[PDB]
Design a protein around this nucleic acid. Sequence first.
DNA 1: ACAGTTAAGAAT
DNA 2: AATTCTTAACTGT
Length: 99
Amino acid sequence: VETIELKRGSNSVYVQYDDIMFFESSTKSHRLIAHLDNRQIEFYGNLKELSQLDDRFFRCHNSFVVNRHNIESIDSKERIVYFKNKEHCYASVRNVKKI
DNA sequence: ACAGTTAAGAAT
DNA sequence: AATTCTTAACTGT
């Protein structure tokens, strides 16, 4: 069991670490979006604390924390991180080396 | 180094 | 249970 509580104010949703492809910032202030296989969950959190949960969670961009276990491939020239579910996000110039 | 954008603290 | 203001730290080139 590697469970994370995604706190939502009137409720919480619980997911496994490896259900999560990546996290990004929401356009709602102080919310993030957890990208699961084919669902997304909005919750209260910050990307910094998620990257500190576990070494699989890597801060590849100011707006993205990726789950290394669910990365399918990486285009290092375009700085695109592709996930097993066929979503993608971006790594910043300063962080792309380290993924 | 630069001009523009944004994550997350403080308050409530 | 959510929202704004704020500003240091980030962004790509």
